[PDB]
Amino acid sequence: SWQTYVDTNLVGTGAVTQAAILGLDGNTWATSAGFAVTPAQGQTLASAFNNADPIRASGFDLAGVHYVTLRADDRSIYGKKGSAGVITVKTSKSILVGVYNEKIQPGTAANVVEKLADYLIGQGF
């Protein structure tokens, strides 16, 4: 879903000053930011979603960013750390990753990512 919205606003700063689309062990789709995630991107998200134990306690880490992760098991997963935030939710067989800094509020980005998804939720991937 963020594919076409990745090369325009959604990523430039249409809610997040950075965003990437990874997940699903089938392949990648499209990313756009200033951080290279290790090759274990789709392998760290599918495994991180085991029992909300590793992501809940201690939190998880990536190339150079990490969060505490509050809830992660229902369907959406927008984690935060107190300054920046990474909205990781599923849509069209892909987990968008709204990577933004403190400039964007954890609510202004969760509101736009909630409506866009609302469109792809009717189907459910």
Swiss-Prot record:
Positions bearing N6,N6,N6-trimethyllysine: 103
Predominant localisation class: cytoplasm
Any one GO cellular component localisation term in the record: cell cortex
Subcellular compartments: Cytoplasm, Cytoskeleton
Gene Ontology molecular functions: actin monomer binding
Renumbered residue ranges of the record's region Actin binding: 1-35
Stated role: Binds to actin and affects the structure of the cytoskeleton. At high concentrations, profilin prevents the polymerization of actin, whereas it enhances it at low concentrations. By binding to PIP2, it inhibits the formation of IP3 and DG.
Name of this protein: Profilin-1A
